[model samples]
Target: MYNFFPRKPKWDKNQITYRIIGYTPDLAPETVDDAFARAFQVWSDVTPLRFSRIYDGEADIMINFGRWEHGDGYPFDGKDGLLAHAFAPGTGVGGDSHFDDDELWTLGKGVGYSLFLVAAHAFGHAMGLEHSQDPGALMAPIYTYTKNFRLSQDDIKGIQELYGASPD
Candidate 1:
């Protein structure tokens, strides 16, 4: 089954802010934050959208770590099952991300799937994308921890479809 769902809506604004409400102890909280920066930069690299991180308060998107049913309909079953998922642009539950804390979180390249990769995939959804059929794509249903990652042309076209080409 495809973990990524269809939600082809995008952030109406170019200036986007996100809040990391909580984190997992698998890595330093700051480390998770750093991973987030990298993950997000991947998409922003090819889109006109800009992002800002917040510790608290309202953000266009909210991210957090949890296990089992984390209040979102897409409950993480832990380990190899729905590593992460996000909502598309909308109100309330929309644009929120949930990572399964029960799964082993990693940062070292090539050893395990890092939060950065998962976040990148999930963020793709948050920014109005969907499951990609390409096995090499970040938005693909299958998750692979590539040592050095970049968005597949499919994903770039996917984002550019919603938010136009990057300001670069």
Candidate 2:
């Protein structure tokens, strides 16, 4: 059985910092960085949460592209199963996100859905959000690329309950 950590109660509001590191030696760092930026923008567009890319030191969030048992207890299964996962909101590993390098990430049509979509869902977890039973919701446990790329009203309500409305 997979072990899941307990989520902490939401408290302070702070900006999240993210840095992307590519796992495959052949993968270009620019590609990984672009993916990270695109993913972060998806969430930022809806939420007031601000994210910045950093070079040195640990940021609030660290995004890494890897396959199978990188470090977290959640070891990803290659292929269509379990695309990615993220840590619950809090200190330390909180806000960290990971993507399975096994998948071919793309940002255009004819290709698979963009990493932005999946990463946006994972970002929900990074911000004290939980998986929704509603398959249409971004936080749905099951990933369907066809689903809407934006967070549903349920998603906004849930986040608001914890962090209040995005700053007016």
Candidate 3:
């Protein structure tokens, strides 16, 4: 059998930055802020990369939340469908992630979509990462909402392999 994996068409540097374009009305802006940090931290903890939040100017990545053709051509399908999307690393439209504001975003599970989970997934794409065929990988295209999450071994390795090994 042949081995199938992905590679880095990713950012060349470790000091990646981001900016939240706006807040989702479903949850307080404070919760969304914390959740966004936690999501990026998941990757930062494993790779040599770091994410810094900026209030103005262009960032390496940008996060936005909107409904129905928010401007990226990848439109939101209203509630219960199409949670979010993102672009891989590059200039202009690349490295930006957009969420469907139509869905109720939640800090906790058993209700609306968890911001932590979806943001983590979207950031994976924003960080020049691709989807995983492995079912347990966070990069997996489809998933169930779980309150607790940890990156699968494959995820850790793939990201580290493309970027850098885990920090000492």
In model 2, which range of ten residues has the least summed lDDT? 1-10
Candidate 3 segments exceeding 4 Å error: 1-7
Clashing pairs in 2: none
* CA lDDT, every model vs. true structure: 0.81, 0.70, 0.83
Strongest candidate by TM-score: 3
lDDT by residue (tens digit), candidate 1, 80-151 = 677777888877778888888878889766665699988988898888777877888888877787677777
Q: By descending lDDT, how would the candidates be arranged?
A: 3, 1, 2
> Poorest 10 consecutive residues of model 1 by lDDT?
1-10
Tell me which of candidates 1 and 3 scores higher on lDDT.
Answer: 3
Give the per-residue lDDT digits (tens) of candidate 3, residues 1-168. 111235457887999889998899888889899999999999999888889999999888888899997877777899877899888788878789888888888876678888999899888888766777788888887856776788888778777776877675
Give model 2's TM-score versus the native structure.
Answer: 0.80
- In the order shown, what is each candidate's alpha-carbon RMSD? 2.7, 4.2, 2.4
Count of backbone clashes, every candidate in sequence: 0, 0, 0
lDDT of 2 by residue, 41-99 (tens): 65566667778888777778888878888887789898758778887876778778888
RMSD of 2: 4.2
Model 1 regions lying over 4 Å from their true place: 1-7, 109-112
Per-residue error for 126 in candidate 3, Å, reads 1.0
Specify the poorest-scoring 10-residue window by lDDT in model 3: 1-10
